[PDB]
Amino acid sequence: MEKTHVQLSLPVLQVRDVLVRGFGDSVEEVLSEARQHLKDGTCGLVEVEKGVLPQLEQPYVFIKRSDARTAPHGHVMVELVAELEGIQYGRSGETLGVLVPHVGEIPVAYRKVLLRKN
Numbered sequence: 001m002e003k004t005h006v007q008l009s010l011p012v013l014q015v016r017d018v019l020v021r022g023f024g025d026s027v028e029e030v031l032s033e034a035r036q037h038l039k040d041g042t043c044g045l046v047e048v049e050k051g052v053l054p055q056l057e058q059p060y061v062f063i064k065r066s067d068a069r070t071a072p073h074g075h076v077m078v079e080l081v082a083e084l085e086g087i088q089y090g091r092s093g094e095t096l097g098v099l100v101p102h103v104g105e106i107p108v109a110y111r112k113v114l115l116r117k118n
């Protein structure tokens, strides 16, 4: 059975290397596909800086900090929040980055997270 939270180490990708720049065409689809790729180990993370989001496809899936009181074992506790046309679906803390499919790109780092399964 799946636990409420899972430890994952996500590959951090540079935006210009990403081949598949989003998970789908609707808020519900991108959240669904992101969660599936997270379970399969085929999800990467792009850190948000100026210029990044316009190079990626909407809707966006962000991982955001869900608890600022403790980060177990160095894994920041995080949850998913989607965004389309300036409207967010969920409310959470600070953005760690935007999730994208990982299809073999070489990462620049790994980001340890404790992901809320839902």
Ligand SMILES: C[C@@H](N)c1ccc(Br)cc1
Residues within 6 Å of the ligand: 020, 101, 103
């Ligand atoms: C199964 C593999 N060909 C693949 C499917 C969808 C996405 Br998104 C990335 C890779």
